[model samples]
Target chain A: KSYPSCILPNNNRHQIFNTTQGHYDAVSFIYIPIDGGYMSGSGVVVGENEILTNKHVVNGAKGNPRNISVHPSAKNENDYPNGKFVGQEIIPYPGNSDLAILRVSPNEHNQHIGQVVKPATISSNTDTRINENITVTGYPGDKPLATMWESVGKVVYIGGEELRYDLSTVGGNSGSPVFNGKNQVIGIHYGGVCNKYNSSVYINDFVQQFLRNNIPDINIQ
Target chain B: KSYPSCILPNNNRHQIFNTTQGHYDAVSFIYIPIDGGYMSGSGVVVGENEILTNKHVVNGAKGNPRNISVHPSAKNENDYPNGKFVGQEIIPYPGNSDLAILRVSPNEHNQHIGQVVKPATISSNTDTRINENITVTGYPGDKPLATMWESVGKVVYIGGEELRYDLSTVGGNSGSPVFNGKNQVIGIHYGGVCNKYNSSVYINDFVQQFLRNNIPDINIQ
Candidate 1:
């Protein structure tokens, strides 16, 4: 099948060298055991023990929390400086939105994710405007395995539940956070077209309320 | 100083998965000994003993041919399946064009580069049109060391000695080959503006004649 939901005009993504810095550390490479292998996607640390990703990433693995690894700031298979955590629970949004909140178990050091990597700052303002510059960071399937890659573009369209931009993305970028100029995540990237635009779940009042209810400690600005 | 000659709108470059395939094998990660470390760029095999890159890359190292290594199909510092070669000679274009040709010594396996990696096809017809899609593959310095990455865009402008595109690039992409639909090289990427466009040395009559004169076996179409 044609995965035309990737590049837009051209690929403007760059490999992030310092994955453990700033909000990059909050971004995680999610792996769910499936059969003998694993299916992967991206997520971001939201609360002390909570992660935000796509519902498909959780549902695709039959919602089995065991063996679900979350490696924050994973550079490669051999390097995940911030350490890895296991998924303890999966909470998909009760509605039709393709969003999910994963509760992660502590790392090997018995430290909560918020203690290891700072949680991402999410925007409370839902007035995301078109042409507003935005950034997306994730571990794209098309890039080197587990490497954090980033792209910057401007908001092109805003739908009822989706915010569209021109950033380049692929399969594994399903749950990447769409950050604004102030480094506040305004949306969660979900899908896009190759030469057109990428769409993200816009951070609306309903989504914010859902997140706040699920992860009470989640700091949203 | 700020090197704003990088991304355009966003970074759309992707890591080349199969580096040994087709024209990718022809692209080489170039390393030149400097001070106590090394400077790097990208190059492409255009003849049995010739490589095409930017004059700045050759001139940057005082035109020293010793300790100048070219790893074809290099995935990382540890993986260079097609093997490595040494620079034997440097031939800078005797004009203002930021272009150069390097002669490489045979690999340790006693094989010419053209024998291991097929030479890149060069477009003789210099009628490169605006909006024509193009691809640039290289080992960017900002990315993982020696990892081959690729970006796709279209010709944005054409000048007497340069062709401009929107491909994202950084320092090590100084000599990336701008490929067209037929997998034929039409230019050599050199510089660009971060949110503007990337400029390449267009394959013109002068460039064709230069390649023909320096490396008679260079195939152009």
Candidate 2:
């Protein structure tokens, strides 16, 4: 018989917050969306009005279906002033990369969203070293905030091609932000097709090319 | 140096149509959709005016985006007639899985979305074995008709509770239909965030439950 998957700090999930226990380098997370009345995924605010998340969370935006909204890990409901509406004018394929970008409408009317959120910067040319400690954050079910996870396995598997992290990700944590020891944006949560365990796709060629492919003027380089 | 992270096609990505093949147990073949836009995603047609796709695809319907249309694989000019509206629902959780059942509207609009698609029976719980060959069909670029990706790979890695497919996939492939050699429904593509290759996630426990929770009566198992 199949059982419900568990998400949370203790139940088969491992995460760290603050540098208190020598834990550092954690940042915002991402969210995915679902149907039926709405409200299925969540993400972290990396930009003023822009929220960062995995392409999985906003996958429904395909075919131009309009039904999407976002909640930041900050747990500030006021941030999302406009009701949930599907994503639009998004960019997915980046000529050979796992990273995808989206263009969404911002609610300048909702000062709250801008007040409590901060966009993250992309860390270029960095690869995950085996066992190198990292951090993550997102509005995972149980609550809305920077949920943490552990980076287990060789820092950079496949010649620094892929990174593995026990980020305690759930169905909703797809696009959350992954941070390096310096608390900078190194990658986004690209896991959760399965659950709990996730393989962090580094934010190098994919992320930059995706942004450039759509917004030719992006200064990613 | 970006490359396909999850896609492990039997041969080459560009040559999929040349050497069509599927895993054991797969029934006929088809194409499906991922969630978002109007409906989560669209799929290939097996029957008349009938289509197969992911439940979440349609679930994203907000205030019902009007004038929704489909662009088939062999599409001509936008001369395709407007798809009349039809209402289809999913079987709650278990039976429903991530599967969506729909009856095209304008019954006469059948000629539009390719051939109406049919579904394969649900296979008994045969646990996922390593290197199990499987095939997937979907609107890779989020088009209407089905695009088949026939190639086999070992179920190399597991994410959360669902099995991971190394085959190539993109946002448009979300909600796509995956099949065993028997052509039966193994699962629907919700999508995975693979920066390097084709990484896909099947609807395991929580994901299925999330869908069920949203539409307690999706299918009513």
Candidate 3:
């Protein structure tokens, strides 16, 4: 049986390395205040110093000081190889929309592994068909640590603002980025039933236009 | 770049699953007796209850019995999803050659995922050219327990008994199977100079004849 050739990458890869760098590096734990304490959710880097997450992730927070922080490549509660970046300001967006963006300072990144923590390349097209393979990696909230897990499955349903998939996801996986085989961020994972059906916020015209007006320097191509 | 499309298996594996399974599942750690106690090496399944490994992996033992155990998909000392299987008997091979085969009991496999562990398909033609992508997986003995690690690179040189590779390997990786992009077991990994160079026993006419004669029920096509 002839199979399709999907080579990992070219060079600088180690024995334990998978592909160039796992997209999980692009994901971060977004910490925002609730009442007196803070809450944690997932987000994806969309600019050199900007992160995109769900509005509900930060909606409960009061004065948006450095109280909100973003930790990239965090394997546990105390492990953040790329260091943590505090949100300096919150970008403007549609009030009714479920999306939100956090702006971070350049010093937040560990420049040693520069490209590893850079902004993600989001997809402009949301016209996806069924059976398109999609991958999602995020920090599940149920776990005490910040370890990330991945799920790969096909698209099941495609409606406005919703993309149902067979990809496995859970509570803490909210605000994860859904990418296609081309490595393009096609959807923003939001919620779903455990092992039943997972859904994401499709990158439609409204979301794209809102990002352009608010996130002008987005790395999305 | 018009490279060859070397598929994993012959079938429509959805947009996700590549082949029946990955080569990683087939590679395992072969624990055999040494002078005092036991040492660990690597091997690959070539049949339902048959494993092909280096003769040196078991040659050091006084009486090669069931002391040589094969652990498939073992992440650590206690992590063997498919369970451990002891060698029931050893097959005869040339004393000078760096090759050996083990016959495992039918009960070694986890009946839940039956046929998940099968023999690898050995390459028929030994006339392999350089520059072909080669992948090898083995347990690094330096680690405390049995864990799987993979290295992907290209064949640098091909000659009499050895096929030289740039794939990084270490001490505990001895007896690892070296396969090509087509998922064909081309060589028996034996020695290497850390990250600089690695060597494997090429599946020459002698090795092929031995497998065909002794390993009659080989699962290889």
Per-candidate interface DockQ score: 0.01, 0.06, 0.01
Cα deviation at A140, candidate 1, in Å, is 42
How would you encode candidate 3's per-residue C-alpha lDDT over B1-221 as one tens digit per residue? 00001111111111111112466677777776644566778888887667777654654332345667787666677767677777766664442235677777755334412255656788875557798887776675645567776668788877655676776665577778888888788888865422234568788777787888877766443
At residue B165, what lDDT does model 2 achieve? 62
Candidate 3, TM-score vs. the true structure? Answer: 0.43
For candidate 1 chain B, the 10 contiguous residues with the lowest summed lDDT are B1-10
Native contacts present in each candidate (fraction): 0.00, 0.07, 0.00
Residues B1-221 of candidate 2: C-alpha lDDT, one tens digit per residue? 01112333432333133212332111122222223212223343323333444433443331132223333332222322223334333222223133443434434544423232222333332554556777665544423333333444445544443455666664445545566566554465544433323443444555445544553333211
Tell me the tens digit of each residue's lDDT in model 3 across A1-221: 00001111111111111212666677777666544555667778887667777654543343343767777777676667677777766663442234567777655334422245767788876457777977776666545656765666788777556676776554456677888887778888765422235567777777788777776677566
Stretches > 4 Å off in candidate 1:
A1-221, B1-4
2 against 3, candidate with superior lDDT: 3
The interface root-mean-square deviation of each model, in the order shown, is 20.4, 13.7, 27.8
Candidate 2 wrong stretches, greater than 4 Å? A1-35, A44-50, A76-88, A95-98, A108-116, A142-161, A192-196, A213-221, B1-221
> Candidate 1's residue-wise lDDT over B1-221, tens digit each?
11313566646889997899977999889987755667788999999988998765664455357657888888887888977899888886644455778899997778998889899999985567999988999988778889999988889888666788877887688888889988899998876532346678888888788888899899998
